Homo-oligomer: A and B are copies of this chain.
């Protein structure tokens, strides 16, 4: 039953994975041994090669991701050997260091032991390994509102933030058998941040905006051939609009457009002046400029869409069906300036893939 669905997903994955690796012949025996290990044990164990390719396929199949051209060069770190919270912490620290790579970001995933009985071995509470805390009480809003619930959970466990607008949340995760998670403060030497300045407008620094270099999503489940890696943080580099058109711009996030309008010297009084649009463009130019100036990888939405067009072309040429989520693939500024806006995408779910899972806080 469980064994059944596990077997089925395993067959589909192993077949596909071995064709892609040019190892079509080895399938039958590999499949045989898997059916055996399943019947005996209730599960099976991926080889390094299978796991690495599975993680790459999962990225390739992520409908909402514009950055998929580079799927085959994902750096996969196999940490299925960790057993202790010190080891998990150190693995997370290491992921940050190697992914950051002095600013020349390496798309990386660290893979922890998978769910056994549906029982998690390691459960990471962070949404991203590096993210800012958020506070809300007494009309007072500080930091990132998206982080309010996790921040509150951390402070329930004895952590205390400085209540700056950019407090780094601690790493926070729970081990199987432990009733509570543990938290560890981030060593600042590991975390690159970028001050936001503008190429022409000197006053832009008065806003004292910054953002972190490397987004490392740590709360999604990687599913490969029926195996559920609920703990498998991965990172790429940012597309500039994620920071400039959302994280810093949304009313429910840092909500900076009025302040941007003021420093760039335009009125924020009339919808018809398109001051929000103008503020968005200057804020987004500033973000790209700032990351490039500091030597931290980033991509603008036009270049990213051009890369994605090549991904589409490669899928076709390889005989692979393309799947995508138009509503997430279009960038949140000038979307009609990209080819993406002007076609449609099949939003079907293909596995291996990355999936949402319920937050253990909230």
- What residues of chain A have their CB less than 8 Å away from a CB belonging to chain B? 245-246, 249-250, 257, 271-274, 276-278, 280-281, 284-285, 288-289, 292, 300, 302-303, 306, 326-327, 330, 332-337, 341
Contact = CB atoms under 8 A, between A and B. Distances in A.
Contacts of A335: 330, 332, 335
Contact of A300 (B274, B303, B333, B341): B274
A337 B277 contact: yes
A296 to B, nearest CB: 13
Given A333-B334, A336-B245, A336-B332, A277 B271 contact: no
Looking at A276, A285, A326, A337, the one whose CB has the most chain B CB atoms below 10 A away is A337
A288 B274 CA distance: 9
Contacts of A330: 335
Given A332-B336, A336-B332, A341-B332, A276 B249 contact: no
A272 B334 CA distance: 13
A284 B277 contact: yes
Contacts of A257: 337
Contacts of A289: 272
Nearest to A334: B277
A272 B337 contact: no
A330 B327 CA distance: 10
B281 A278 contact: yes
Given A300-B272, A327-B326, A337 B280 contact: yes
Contacts of A276: 302, 334, 337
Contacts of A288: 272, 274
A333 B303 contact: no
Contact of A250 (B284, B303, B336): B336
A149 to B, nearest CB: 19
A274 B284 contact: yes
16 contacts: A245-B336, A246-B336, A249-B336, A250-B336, A272-B288, A272-B300, A274-B300, A274-B302, A276-B302, A276-B337, A277-B337, A281-B281, A332-B334, A332-B341, A333-B336, A335-B335
Contacts of A273: 285
A278 B300 CA distance: 14
Contacts of A292: 272
A279 to B, nearest CB: 9
A271 B336 contact: no
Contacts of A280: 277, 334, 337
Contacts of A303: 271-272
